[PDB]
Amino acid sequence: SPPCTTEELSPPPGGSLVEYSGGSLRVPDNPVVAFIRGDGVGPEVVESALKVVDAAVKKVYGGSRRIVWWELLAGHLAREKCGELLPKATLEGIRLARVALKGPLETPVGTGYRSLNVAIRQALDLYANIRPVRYYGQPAPHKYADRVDMVIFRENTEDVYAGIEWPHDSPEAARIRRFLAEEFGISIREDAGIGVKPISRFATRRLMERALEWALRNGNTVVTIMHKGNIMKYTEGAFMRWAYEVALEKFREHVVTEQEVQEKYGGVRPEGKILVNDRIADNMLQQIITRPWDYQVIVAPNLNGDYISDAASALVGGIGMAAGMNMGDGIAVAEPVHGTAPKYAGKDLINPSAEILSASLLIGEFMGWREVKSIVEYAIRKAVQSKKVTQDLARHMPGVQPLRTSEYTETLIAYIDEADLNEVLAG
Ligand X SMILES: O=P(O)(O)O[C@@H]1[C@H](O)[C@@H](COP(=O)(O)OP(=O)(O)OC[C@H]2O[C@@H](O)[C@H](O)[C@@H]2O)O[C@H]1n1cnc2c1ncn1ccnc21
Residue 110 interacts with, from a second copy, ligand X, none (CB under 5-8 Å by kind): none
The count of residues interacting with ligand X (CB under 6 A) is 8
Q: Which helix (H) or strand (E) holds 66?
A: none
In the range 232-261, which residues lie near ligand X by CB under 6 A?
Answer: none
C-beta of 315 vs 362, nearer to a second copy: 315
| Under rule CB under 8 A, residue 245 binds a second copy | no
State yes or no: residue 183 binds a second copy (CB under 8 A). Answer: yes
Q: Is position 397 an interface residue for a second copy (rule: CB under 8 A)?
A: no
363/375 Cα distance (integer angstroms)? 12
**What 3-state class would DSSP assign to 47?**
helix
* Residue 163 exposed, middle or buried by CB count within 10 Å (0-12, 13-18, 19+): exposed
As a whole number of angstroms, the distance between CA 228 and CA 244 comes to 15
C-alpha closest to that of 159 among 204, 201, 199: 199
Stretch that binds ligand X, among 35-43, 60-68, 199-207, 414-422 (CB under 6 A): 60-68
Output the CA torsion sign for 182, 187, 193, 196.
Answer: negative
Residues of this chain, 217-236, that bind a second copy according to CB under 8 A: 228, 230-235
- For residues 74 and 117, give the distance between their C-alpha atoms in angstroms, rounded to a whole number: 10
Residue 20 binds ligand X, judged by CB under 6 A = no
The annotation status of 339 as a binding-site residue, yes or no, is yes
84 binds ligand X, rule: CB under 6 A? no
Q: Whose CA is closest to 70, among 20, 8, 26?
A: 8
Q: How many CA atoms lie within 13 A of 263 on its CB side?
A: 4
128 binds a second copy (CB under 8 A): no
To the query of whether residue 39 is one of the catalytic residues in this protein, the response is no
* Closer to ligand X by Cβ: residue 197 or 373: 373
Identify which of residues 68 and 176 has a Cβ nearer to a second copy in the complex. Answer: 176
CA dist 29 and 20 (Å) reads 15
Identity of the residue, 101 or 372, whose beta carbon is nearer to ligand X in the bound complex: 372
Q: Which position among 197, 228, 382, 388 bears the catalytic label?
A: 228
First and final C-alpha spacing in the chain: 43
- CA–CA separation, 49 vs 361, rounded Å? 12
Give whole-number Cα distances, 361 to 109, 272, 343, 419, in Å.
Answer: 31, 25, 27, 20
Which does residue 290 touch among ligand X, a second copy, none (CB within 5 to 8 A, set by kind)? a second copy
Report d(CA 202, CA 189) in Å as an integer: 33
Round to whole Å and give the CA distance between 65 and 30. Answer: 6
Residue list 132-171, contact with a second copy (CB under 8 A) = 140-144, 158, 160-161, 163-168, 170
Give the one residue of 65, 76, 177, 210 binding ligand X; rule: CB under 6 A.
65
- Is residue 392 part of an annotated ligand binding site? yes
193 interacts with, out of ligand X, a second copy, none, CB within 5 to 8 A per kind? a second copy
Nearer to a second copy, 139 or 346 (CB): 139
Q: Is 282 tagged catalytic?
A: yes
**Could you say whether residue 185 binds a second copy (CB under 8 A)?**
no
161 is catalytic: yes
Task: Supply the residues annotated as catalytic.
Answer: 161, 228, 282, 306
Q: Contact positions toward ligand X, by CB under 6 A?
A: 29, 61, 64-65, 369-372
